[PDB]
Design a protein around this ligand. Sequence first.
Ligand SMILES: Nc1ncnc2c1ncn2[C@@H]1O[C@H](COP(=O)(O)OP(=O)(O)OP(O)(O)=S)[C@@H](O)[C@H]1O
Ligand SMILES: Nc1ncnc2c1ncn2[C@@H]1O[C@H](COP(=O)(O)OP(=O)(O)OP(O)(O)=S)[C@@H](O)[C@H]1O
Lengths: 387, 392
Amino acid sequence: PKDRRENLQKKLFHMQQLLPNSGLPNLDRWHSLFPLDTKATRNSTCFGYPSWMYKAQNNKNGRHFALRRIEGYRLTNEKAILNVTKEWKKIINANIVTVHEAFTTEFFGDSSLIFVYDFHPLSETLYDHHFPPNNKIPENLLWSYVCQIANALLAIHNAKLAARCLELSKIIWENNRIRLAACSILDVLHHKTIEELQQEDFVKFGRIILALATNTPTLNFNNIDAALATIVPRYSTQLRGVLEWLIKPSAPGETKTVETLLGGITTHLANFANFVMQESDEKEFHLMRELENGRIARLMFKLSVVNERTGERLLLKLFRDYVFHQVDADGKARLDTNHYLNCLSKLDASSEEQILLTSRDNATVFVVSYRSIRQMLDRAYGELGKE
Amino acid sequence: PKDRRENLQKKLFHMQQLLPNSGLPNLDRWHSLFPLDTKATRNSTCFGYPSWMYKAQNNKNGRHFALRRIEGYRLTNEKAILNVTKEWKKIINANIVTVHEAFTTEFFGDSSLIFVYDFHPLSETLYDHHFPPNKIPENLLWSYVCQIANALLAIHNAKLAARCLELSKIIWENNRIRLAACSILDVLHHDSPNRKTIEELQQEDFVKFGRIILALATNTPTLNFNNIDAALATIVPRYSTQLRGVLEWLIKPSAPGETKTVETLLGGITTHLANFANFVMQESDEKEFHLMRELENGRIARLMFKLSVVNERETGERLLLKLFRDYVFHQVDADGKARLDTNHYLNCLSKLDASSEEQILLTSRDNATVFVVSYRSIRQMLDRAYGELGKE
Ligand SMILES: Nc1ncnc2c1ncn2[C@@H]1O[C@H](COP(=O)(O)OP(=O)(O)OP(O)(O)=S)[C@@H](O)[C@H]1O
Ligand SMILES: Nc1ncnc2c1ncn2[C@@H]1O[C@H](COP(=O)(O)OP(=O)(O)OP(O)(O)=S)[C@@H](O)[C@H]1O
């Protein structure tokens, strides 16, 4: 479908996107740096330092990656990078943006620390997404968020680690898929036990969901119980119950763990697993249909290698003119992308439909089907492979 | 990849796939019936009647569906088909082959009852897959447990039961399993003495659940009543203790003080549902990269469309596009023989599509002149020339 296709068109387009007038310094291992930031203002609330986001191409493999730059940071200990990235690089999770390495650079005309993450096109912060630069969220979507975050914490926690940074602005959204996008950063900048940090995780978890449910971006100390009571008419009591459990501190004799929360999740984990599957299935049928592009592109390779290098190949020449050199009555071009598309669709299927191939010298004209032409193309292409 | 390319084409070929000499009769709304039974033998153990499987194309929408034929069933009551399919038609679940309708027909030269299901290409029965005509990994077994649990959850919350729960009636396709005989016994037992309650029937599901997994785990197709506890102690060394505990919980009838529900099983599974959920998600992501690649192919094809339109329509700035085409596809070796290289073709057009800043050398027909040019420059010459033809 169209929305799915235009989403994919927007993803591929974001990756190629550049800014011809931009002046950002090329790194030793990176080039084509592109800004990901959506506003012109930066605060040090999130990191303790100003932050910049960029899309860049790797010089060695050419793939695109995301770089989070921390402004005004000087390395005072090579252990702070090495003792953190050694643990976080290993963590691979569908709801955590994977980090690869961390290094300092001086190319920004200052001292910056640079983290590399997987680049996810069209990702926008969960904050900006539910609170635009200027109603209520379905409960199902809220449960989608809880399950995804639960999946992440289970894995982080299975590594004797903690998220530390768990906020609306550091979780990326892309078609209802959310990921933790600031991992391993506070781990480095700070050099306090992991368990208490793990407990704060549950707390930060709760405020994020609570914020979305009550439609309030900024969160205060005073309404952890007030805003908790605004959700009972709009949402189920089960929802309010989970939020209450994550956010409230005590857990007096047996402290909060992810494994205990899961039974709390229950059907939504099963339901959720069902949803991702319905989605993986829908992509499967959508994939098979696109396979034609590969079949069509591969046909164009063959036709172009053969053309213009005589014989049976004359028809193939006459065929290209038929597909692409069509003109209107005044001599004006009859550009029709659909025509290009439909000829090749028919060529790929070895369609039995017939066409008229007039030579430049009009004395001879060939009546032929797409099937025959298709068989002719592979033939000529195969004879070039013999030598 | 080779496997990814080959698996998906095998799906599309199977949906369209034919057998001309079959002699099979078109129904009131269906045509082009293609047989799916892979074996030459039929027993009436599963349904009580011989069964036949077909793929058929719908007369109205042209889409393919699977039809399970029950040979020799005479309709004695319409309430049997309405009362059942109205509840099951409502259920949409990824581990359940969705059922649409049920009707009788006489086109087979007899009395047949027909169920229509969604058609899932390249599907094979869980039985034939693991027991064809060394250990099954534990990860895969939990995947089956999670999927079946997912199905039972949806079924049970609909005040229904699986009824049909066997290896031969579950289809496997790339580690994805689905129940493929649902709503049938609902019909075939719709009219019989001593009916069990949906509550009692729901309990049998759990028992059949355990036996299926147990069967895969003990790698014994045939399972007997005497080894429900015997075959159960062989898996603690091969498999984890959690797994044995769950099978025991599912299979044993007793439900000693309370009877078993899926909601209770779910909490028993715990991390394995997350593991599974995490896995399906990553696999769904990989399809996204393959998807984008194919969409990319569309962009490459659209570039060559433009390029083919311009070429042989020249000199000037279009002479370079002509020379670019020679550069990409008319490459020859030192001997003079053609140098076919799809990779060369591929990487050139990728660079053309990205408006790469990389430069390449374009030699003219006459070996005297060579153009130092970038893909970006080539790209801008290409789009500029293509736009100027729509202007006239
Ligand atoms: N792995 C990633 N892949 C792609 N885009 C990403 C990735 N991680 C982050 N982003 C993008 O980078 C941005 C990071 O968020 P920020 O720009 O720091 O939020 P912000 O609030 O606008 O800026 P502040 O206030 O200075 S933290 C998001 O808008 C995402 O779109
Ligand atoms: N809903 C379905 N969609 C696609 N293929 C299906 C479906 N249901 C069953 N099949 C295929 O049916 C084939 C065999 O059908 P079955 O009736 O389940 O087994 P069988 O051994 O051929 O027949 P009997 O009578 O049980 S011995 C399997 O290889 C499956 O791929």
